[PDB]
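Why predict the complex rather than its parts? Because the way molecules touch one another can change local conformation, and only a joint prediction can capture that. The input here totals 100 residues.
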Amino acid sequence: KVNPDGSQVRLKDVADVGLGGQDYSINAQFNGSPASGIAIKLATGANALD
Amino acid sequence: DVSSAIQAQNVQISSGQLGGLPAVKGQQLNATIIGKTRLQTAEQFENILL
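Output of the joint prediction:
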């Protein structure tokens, strides 16, 4: 906004604007060190091994 | 006017979460906050300021 006299307000000084994460709730790690993984399911139809 | 009134006065308060992720070191208590649902009674309706 642009309250009466001087200039205008940008977003930076109303808030922090960082490239964060869509959803922080689910987190995972492998052995110790942090990781991220995708856990696949097998479509009703197809062959496990293949 | 009445339509608009009811639309602003018979809504669900969306409600967030106390200690939502990401949270600051400590947090400890993570609990959902429930707001108000909606009017139920015929009275609740007869109310609502116009």
